[PDB]
Amino acid sequence: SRAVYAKLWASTAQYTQRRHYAWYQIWSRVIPWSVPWGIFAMWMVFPAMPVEYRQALTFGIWQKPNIGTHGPDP
Amino acid sequence: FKLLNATKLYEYCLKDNRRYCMFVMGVGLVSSWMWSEWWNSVWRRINKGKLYNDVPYVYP
Ligand SMILES: CCCCCCCCCCCCCCCCCC(=O)OC[C@H](COP(=O)([O-])OCC(O)COP(=O)([O-])OC[C@@H](COC(=O)CCCCCCCCCCCCCCCCC)OC(=O)CCCCCCCCCCCCCCCCC)OC(=O)CCCCCCCCCCCCCCCCC
């Protein structure tokens, strides 16, 4: 019947929308890889920043190294 | 082995490779910092009295 043939033709009318739904599915699996790569980036540029900023991103945990040199002058 | 398995570190941090790599980079960042700080303290204790900051210079 022509009615049946019409519904079969229309079954694939929303190709473009289904490709967009594919985009979402794949990008949701891939986007978490930004965290490992992000930690390493900050890890690399941390020593090139000022001392004042290095103590802020760590909540006062980080401090200058104490190796026993360059102490105050009497 | 029973104690390790009861922390659920495998289920939450090592079963998924994306999270496994988060664990590697994060733990390595913190561990490397504690390792250096500890070795500096040992160095200062063994060498007490010989380093520059331990003997203030007196002017004539
Ligand atoms: C069962 C088995 C058990 C076995 C036994 C146990 C095993 C384990 C034992 C391990 C013991 C330790 C072992 C030693 C390890 C450490 C030593 C070591 O390795 O040192 C390296 C060693 C020397 O180390 P070093 O450089 O002296 O170390 C200095 C420090 O790094 C000093 O660094 P720094 O001072 O410059 O910077 C430090 C700074 C660095 O700081 C930073 O960079 C960033 C700081 C700001 C972070 C801001 C974060 C903001 C967001 C916070 C979010 C919070 C959420 C809270 C949620 C709460 C929820 C309730 O960090 C801090 O200040 C501390 C951090 C405090 C803040 C807390 C936050 C931390 C970050 C957290 C991130 C997120 C984690 C979770 C993620 C997942 C969930 C989301 O180097 C060598 O030996 C080099 C040798 C030569 C290597 C040659 C390599 C090959 C060369 C050829 C290459 C070409 C060929 C290719 C080859 C490729 C091969 C692969």
Instruction: Extract the tokens encoding A13.
Output: 């009318």
- Quote the DSSP letter at residue B51: S
Residue B13 backbone phi and psi in degrees, to 5: -140, -20
Interface contact B46, partner A, CB < 8 A:
no
Contacts of A62 (CB under 8 A, 6+ apart): A54, A55, B33
Distance, in Å, from the CA atom of A13 to the CA atom of A42, rounded to the nearest integer, reads 47
Experimentally determined by: cryo-EM
Contact A73, B58 (CB under 8 A): no
* Angstrom resolution of this structure: 1.8
Contacts of B31 (CB under 8 A, 6+ apart): none
Q: Which residues in chain A are contacts of B22 at CB distance < 8 A?
A: 35-36, 39
Output b/e per residue, A20-39; b: 16+ Cβ within 10 A: eeeeeeeeeeeeeeeebeeb
**Helix, strand, coil: what percent of chain A each, to 5?**
65, 0, 35
B25 and A43 in contact by Cβ < 8 A? yes
